């Protein structure tokens, strides 16, 4: 996360870490959506241009964390994967369209002060909240500045970072880039004239973009961190997988394993 802050403890207790077993690495962010289901970006697992194709035994899920690097001994929970599910029409060949995956945990996690699921949107929450100018919140342990294209200053956070970003009009999203923007995406971030800034960045992929409902005071996941060009570049925006538009597929896999 670029230009964010340290998260408070328990502020984002659905945040999950995707952690590689060997060599041990943070791969990406992710989200806890029930006691045995995690939501992430499909590109975290499957990206054939780079010969990236993770399978269940490749990976650990770490839940309840604050510190990026330590083993948070009686706080975090580490889980094994039983099944990975990537969307059948994820488009890795051109634009990362439908960039979503479900992972089912070997055993259900127990909830705690630090571990608690986020809600998924329904039609009318999506309708009411997913609007331009409304801010949501992104979290993660990824780089503090841009990246591939690598960087200086600080690099990697000690602790979970937060940033809050406004949603941007679809026209300005499509006019900031040459990539084909689909309906399964939205973009977020501040405009170059607005004076605030901030963004996700590498290693933040796969985590939650969340909004708090003003009707029932709950947190809902509206987006998954998917892609951007650079990180926190003027007149560039971050692109997120639109979670309500892929919800049929999510319900499909959870109901029928379940």
């Amino acid at each position: 996360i670029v230009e964010g802050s340290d998260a408070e403890i328990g502020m984002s207790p659905w945040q999950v870490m995707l952690f590689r077993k060997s060599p041990q690495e943070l791969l990406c962010g992710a989200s806890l959506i029930s006691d045995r289901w995690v939501l992430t970006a499909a590109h975290c697992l499957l990206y054939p241009p780079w010969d990236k194709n993770f399978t269940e035994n490749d990976l650990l899920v770490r839940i309840g964390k604050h510190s990026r690097t330590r083993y948070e001994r009686n706080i975090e929970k580490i889980s094994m994967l039983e099944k990975i599910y990537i969307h059948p029409r994820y488009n890795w060949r051109e634009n990362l369209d439908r960039d979503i995956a479900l992972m089912k945990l070997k055993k259900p996690v127990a909830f705690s002060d630090y571990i608690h699921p986020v809600c998924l949107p329904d039609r009318e929450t999506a309708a009411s909240l997913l609007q331009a100018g409304y801010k949501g919140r992104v979290t993660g342990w990824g780089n503090l500045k841009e990246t591939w294209t690598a960087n200086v200053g600080k690099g990697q956070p000690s602790v979970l970072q937060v940033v809050n970003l406004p949603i941007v009009e679809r026209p300005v999203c499509k006019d900031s880039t040459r990539i084909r923007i689909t309906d399964n995406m939205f973009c977020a971030g501040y405009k170059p004239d607005e004076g605030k800034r901030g963004d996700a960045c590498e290693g933040d992929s796969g985590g939650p973009f969340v909004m708090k409902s003003p009707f029932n005071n709950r947190w809902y996941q509206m987006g998954i961190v998917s892609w951007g060009e650079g990180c926190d570049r003027d007149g560039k925006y971050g692109f997120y997988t639109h979670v309500f538009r892929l919800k049929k597929w999510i319900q499909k896999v959870i109901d029928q394993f379940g």
Partner: peptide, 10 residues
């Protein structure tokens, strides 16, 4: 970087 995690997780 990463602290070592317990062996029963691998």
């Amino acid at each position: 970087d990463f602290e070592e995690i317990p062996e029963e997780y691998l």
